[PDB]
């Protein structure tokens with residue numbers, strides 16, 4: 173709520189549109205972590221939610237975690253990834269005055285075709301998994317995802333844990349939020365049937381528990397020990413999480 177557009181635009185390179193450098197962009201992509209002008213945000217709407225989730229900095233409400241998330245990413249960071257090879261390819265980015273068509277071609281090459289990426293972010297999924305854990309590196313998570321990292325990557329042969337479960341073990345609201353904006357299944361369990369909600373409640377992370385409930389975590393899911401999150405909350409003597417879970421059931 174605290175002027176979102178002022179705060180988000182005050183971040184490194186966020187006062188130029190990410191795709192065409194149009195000044196004072198008032199739009200955003202919340203899974204990418206970037207600001208966009210009227211023209212480029214309109215084009216992002218073309219791509220679909222898998223590539224880009226468009227929001228207004230001035231006209232839409234913003235959850236505080238999400239503002240903070242925007243502040244750890246930003247145009248400079250994201251362009252270091254998505255436009256990494258532009259200089260080496262000798263190709264020319266659009267400016268503010270360019271044709272809709274020219275911006276369309278650039279945006280599609282950049283985000284769909286992934287044409288300007290470096291070759292390596294060798295294992296994008298494992299990199300995402302590592303970068304989501306304590307202490308998380310959101311630029312590294314962004315780089316891994318741009319290189320095709322599965323947001324629901326399973327750490328096989330080991331514990332079958334996911335990046336979301338790692339971000340949960342790290343107590344990282346930001347990394348959790350980032351993964352969820354990028355399609356993480358809030359219900360995907362590890363080998364012991366313990367989903368992100370189970371982990372939040374094992375570790376006494378009330379904020380993360382509340383985050384997962386807001387995003388449709390299954391209240392009734394039972395782990396390999398037959399425990400749902402309420403049972404873990406009782407057994408850990410955690411009055412706040414018991415309260416949450418009981419309220420969520422109502």
Ligand SMILES: [Zn+2]
Nearest residue numbers: 189192209212
């Ligand atoms: Zn633009």
